[PDB]
Symmetry: C4
Subunit: 206 residues, 4 copies
């Protein structure tokens, strides 16, 4: 639980995220809770040139280390740490099926029982607001109140969890749910869903 073990996993998550096809168009941002703020990936540097010493600490006041530019999307990683106190790692990306679904501006309903992993009977879509703005943050903060993952209209996904390992696993899971919904949406609308009861038992079980 040293700074650099934390900055290495963040890097490992980038590379691994890219491995899975989650980060295409080198746009993801990864962060973890630390001290009174967080560590996040820097802006600019492509993921393959990232060393532990690129990772930027941002304190709880919004000030970032000297001579380092945090991701341009950092403000909403801060929103999720204050909206979800149990959240300890945060993953963001423009994964394609997620984003297609966010362009349609729809929530993904309970088409498959793994929707439960994000906490309920859906994956919501928060409305559009320019990137890096405080209003973008307000949407995300209210979206993540009862869910661990959220789509972002005309933009992409955010997934939060107790460590990067599970944060990643959820992000990825939601990408699969996303693809499944688009692929069936092209055949029939609406798509058959599982009742709220049924999701209730899966959540009890989970």
């Amino acid at each position: 639980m040293e700074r650099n073990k934390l900055a290495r996993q963040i890097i490992d998550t980038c590379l691994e995220m890219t491995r899975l096809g989650l980060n295409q168009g080198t746009a993801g941002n990864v962060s973890v809770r630390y001290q009174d703020g967080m560590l996040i990936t820097p802006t600019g540097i492509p993921y393959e040139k990232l060393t532990e010493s690129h990772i930027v600490f941002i304190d709880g006041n919004g000030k970032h280390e000297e001579g380092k530019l945090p991701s341009s999307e950092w403000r909403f990683h801060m929103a999720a740490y204050q909206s979800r106190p149990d959240a300890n790692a945060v993953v963001h990306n423009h994964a394609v099926h997620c984003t297609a679904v966010s362009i349609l501006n729809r929530s993904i309903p309970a088409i498959h029982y793994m929707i439960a992993a994000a906490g309920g009977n859906s994956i919501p879509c928060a409305p559009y607001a320019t990137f890096g703005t405080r209003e973008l943050s307000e949407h995300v903060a209210l979206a993540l109140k009862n869910r661990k993952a959220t789509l972002l209209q005309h933009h992409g996904l955010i997934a939060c969890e107790v460590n990067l390992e599970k944060a990643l696993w959820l992000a990825h899971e939601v990408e699969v749910l996303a693809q499944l919904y688009l692929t069936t949406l092209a055949i029939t609308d609406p798509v058959p869903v599982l009742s709220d009861e049924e999701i209730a038992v899966v959540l009890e079980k989970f």
Copy 2:
């Protein structure tokens, strides 16, 4: 035919299954017939951390080794060993095209002559029932009576065979059949199919 040669192939099948894009969202479960029960992958451990000594033996009575948690989906691997006496390895996964087809709750008809590999003129979809429950098992058991692979509504696929090598090969084959049906379903419905006669000769031939 030692315990560990069996637990290694199970692992090799996981990794290889993941290689092909069959296991996405680390959800597959693999098992083989053994003694009076089976060996299966454990629950929790991601596939890349699996050693031979993680694999859990479950006896024919339903009791699993001490201090090891079998997959949460083990009950229906047991159903397939008792429904199909010739089945010696079992593969399960939430492969995406299979699952999309299982969300539509349709059977995949004879759109291509390789449907014969699973034993007949289709790949059925058994109805939904909560995971890990005995009622889930009853559906799978009656589904696999005349077929070696079956979809599972709002859930995924199960494929059984004489060893893991062919169990895997079928699983994979069905994923391709799945994709083919969705891709053509988006253009025209119904999708052109091959007569029952025609499937009869392919089965004779096969």
Copy 3:
């Protein structure tokens, strides 16, 4: 131009074909012209266990080496060598977009100027006939008369060329044309095409 240089490239083509996503569900068959017959991949053996000494010579009379089983699909590799005298290597596969298009039983029209690589303004679909039968051969033989690649109804693709390098390149090219046609077919039908004149100049040019 020894037997084994020829059997190695056949293997290299299998592995490479699998690399590109052309051979999924280990179904492709590869062959090259040799002496008075050809060399072809054997039936059964998965591609990763193939050594040069697995490759089976089939003479012009239809008799195959002693103690070796040629692909089950060999008869139509022989049809293409007698239908196209300039053909020296032959590639076959159940590539998914090609096959989806062959399930719709449509020819792929001049949607993109690379259709010219196969010799004209389309990639035809020959009608269905059971695999391995002489009637399957008659369809393929008349299909390849004026084209170097052909789809096969409810089955897959065949592509022929002066060596394996170009045979492969065409096979692959046709897979891309296939995907392009399906992807646009789901939006609008018919798909915009390039006039016959226009294809004429591309062929002059090519």
Copy 4:
């Protein structure tokens, strides 16, 4: 900034472009500004056999080095260097989602805020004209006047930038935008877009 550092990156871009799934059917062409002309990939040679000494210098007069054939598509890399004076590297490819969109002959509108990377509220499609012709060049030259990437009807994509690193990054970005538009187009038409105002702020911001 030697000739060979420039010819190596061109090669690295080919291989890397192929890595991402941008160059399928070995059709891409890459070039960089040099002296009074450019360096470009040669025609024929597959990308895996390219050494630095294959790369052909073409002067500003249209004459190419002795005993070397430039890409057949070189004329329009020259058009982009004279249409966009700030352009220093050029990437071209028949990437599949881009091309499907170019077969529909539509421009990709502001479905996602990254459309701004190419300079405005869209990615245009220039009309069809035979490859390698001066009229093909006139279309591309007027297309790239206010945009850094353009689709080409029934053909593919062109993306230009200050070096190969960003030229590639844009090409790739546009492929993702392309896929997103097709995937949502199959569900609903028109696809929801972001106002011109909204794109204006993203461009200010960017």
